[PDB]
Amino acid sequence: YCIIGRCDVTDNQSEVADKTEDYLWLKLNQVCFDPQDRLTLSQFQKQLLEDYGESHFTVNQQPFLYFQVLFLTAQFEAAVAFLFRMERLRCHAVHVALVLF
């Protein structure tokens, strides 16, 4: 219902969206464009990394999980710098920067 109506943005529907990708997909189907019970890409993209930074998404020591969160929200610079710090994934982060360049 609230995937069709883009409502109840605060309720993460955790009963059915238990994975991270299920959350991203749940919200990107809820973002809106031009006051209550409404979320926009700017709020969502900022809300995610500002409040729930790397710390929240890298506790499982899985780096790509956070990268996908930033890249699939149009925050390409964040995801590039972030992934560029993983000494094992420097190569990959430089190139995804070149492509964007």
């Binding site: 993460n12 499982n60 999980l65």
Partner: peptide, 8 residues
């Protein structure tokens, strides 16, 4: 309260 469990 988003989960941190990656789709595996």
């Amino acid at each position: 309260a988003p989960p941190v469990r990656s789709i595996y």
